[PDB]
Amino acid sequence: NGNSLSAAELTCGMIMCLARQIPQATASMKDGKWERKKFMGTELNGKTLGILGLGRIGREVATRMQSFGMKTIGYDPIISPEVSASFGVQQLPLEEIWPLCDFITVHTPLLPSTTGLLNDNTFAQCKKGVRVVNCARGGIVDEGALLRALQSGQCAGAALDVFTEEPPRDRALVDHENVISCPHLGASTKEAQSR
Amino acid sequence: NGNSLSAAELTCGMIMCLARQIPQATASMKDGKWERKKFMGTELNGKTLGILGLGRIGREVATRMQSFGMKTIGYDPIISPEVSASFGVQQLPLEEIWPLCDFITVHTPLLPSTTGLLNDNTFAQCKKGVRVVNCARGGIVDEGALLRALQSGQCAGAALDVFTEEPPRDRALVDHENVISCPHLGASTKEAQSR
Numbered sequence: 001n002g003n004s005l006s007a008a009e010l011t012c013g014m015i016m017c018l019a020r021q022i023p024q025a026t027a028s029m030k031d032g033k034w035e036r037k038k039f040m041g042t043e044l045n046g047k048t049l050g051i052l053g054l055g056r057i058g059r060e061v062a063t064r065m066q067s068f069g070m071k072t073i074g075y076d077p078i079i080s081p082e083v084s085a086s087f088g089v090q091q092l093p094l095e096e097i098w099p100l101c102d103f104i105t106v107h108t109p110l111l112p113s114t115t116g117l118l119n120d121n122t123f124a125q126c127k128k129g130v131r132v133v134n135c136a137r138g139g140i141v142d143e144g145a146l147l148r149a150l151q152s153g154q155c156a157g158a159a160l161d162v163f164t165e166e167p168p169r170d171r172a173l174v175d176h177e178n179v180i181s182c183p184h185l186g187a188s189t190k191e192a193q194s195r
Numbered sequence: 196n197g198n199s200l201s202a203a204e205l206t207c208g209m210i211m212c213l214a215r216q217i218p219q220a221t222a223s224m225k226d227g228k229w230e231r232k233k234f235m236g237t238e239l240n241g242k243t244l245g246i247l248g249l250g251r252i253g254r255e256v257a258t259r260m261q262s263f264g265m266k267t268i269g270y271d272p273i274i275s276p277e278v279s280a281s282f283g284v285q286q287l288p289l290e291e292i293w294p295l296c297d298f299i300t301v302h303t304p305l306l307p308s309t310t311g312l313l314n315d316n317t318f319a320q321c322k323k324g325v326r327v328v329n330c331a332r333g334g335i336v337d338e339g340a341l342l343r344a345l346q347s348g349q350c351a352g353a354a355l356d357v358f359t360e361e362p363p364r365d366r367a368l369v370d371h372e373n374v375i376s377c378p379h380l381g382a383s384t385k386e387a388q389s390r
């Protein structure tokens with residue numbers, strides 16, 4: 001609400017970080033290395049971003065990423081397709097979303113229907129090399145399934161602000177070379193903090 | 196041209212990384228830490244972005260950062276104020292730009308007139324806490340002056356894709372906690388590479 005924009009901005013930051021491996025490149029630089037060929041990335045323009053959860057944060061993410069030329073599609077059980085069209089999000093059923101996306105971002109509450117929304121089944125339906133972002137609630141993305149998808153290359157990268165347990169006690173995700181992370185910083189701006 | 200969008204996209208990534216310290220937070224997480232107060236950041240909405248160089252890259256940066264609610268102002272001696280108005284950038288003389296900006300990004304060639312465009316004299320005219328990006332040409336930002344500004348806090352952070360010498364032999368900038376960097380990745384996308 002107040003803090004909608006801080007979350008939406010972090011999410012868009014994470015999308016850009018996944019496309020260009022900025023965190024990993026800075027780490028490489030700080031370790032004294034100049035590794036240009038390693039950190040070959042991708043352009044956002046013309047890519048498809050799937051947005052799962054089309055409330056305020058989802059809508060804000062959409063309109064920012066639309067300025068990058070991304071195609072924004074998505075799904076939300078409550079919001080009508082004509083309403084999401086009005087903010088440039090094409091709604092399709094979930095089963096249709098997975099194979100189209102280059103990037104997926106989640107913006108749902110944590111409910112039975114959204115716990116493990118991304119799981120071994122839904123990762124297998126994605127395009128090989130999909131990049132995922134969770135700046136919403138820990139557990140929306142099944143962490144074990146994510147790890148397996150990163151290990152196989154079915155997922156080329158992931159950005160996590162939130163974890164099933166905080167701080168995460170299992171470190172295998174965090175430590176993966178294709179995972180970027182923050183300690184639940186979505187609301188952590190001076191502005192959000194200070195109404 | 197071909198590669199305009201890859202440079203512009205990286206620049207926008209770097210601005211979001213400065214606002215939220217994504218690379219430093221990832222490093223902290225990978226070292227097993229959970230440091231929430233350390234990485235309190237700022238919101239981009241409502242802030243002023245100064246764009247120095249209003250050719251194709253500069254214009255693309257402007258229109259993307261406008262979607263975040265940033266006020267975009269700038270300077271370019273060759274681009275008419277009418278042309279820059281067409282993409283929502285108010286041109287002002289340099290002297291008027293420095294004090295207004297929360298963020299500054301450079302998109303000029305390297306010429307006598309732009310070597311040290313940001314230097315001790317122009318840092319001194321900036322708002323305390325300014326954040327700077329150079330994804331254009333190494334030497335636009337004077338490296339010794341940038342280090343002095345980061346040491347005093349006159350500059351709160353900087354993002355560098357390019358250096359006066361590549362790789363930089365002096366590591367004090369790269370090693371600073373408030374500096375984000377990449378090994379000249381601006382054109383390093385699969386797309387740019389493959390027309």
Ligand SMILES: Oc1noc2ccccc12
Binds near residue numbers: 076
């Ligand atoms: O409850 C939900 N809010 O947004 C969703 C998106 C996908 C599946 C379920 C939900």
Ligand SMILES: Oc1noc2ccccc12
Binds near residue numbers: 248308312
């Ligand atoms: O000479 C210049 N080329 O582009 C510029 C932008 C700002 C200030 C000077 C110049």
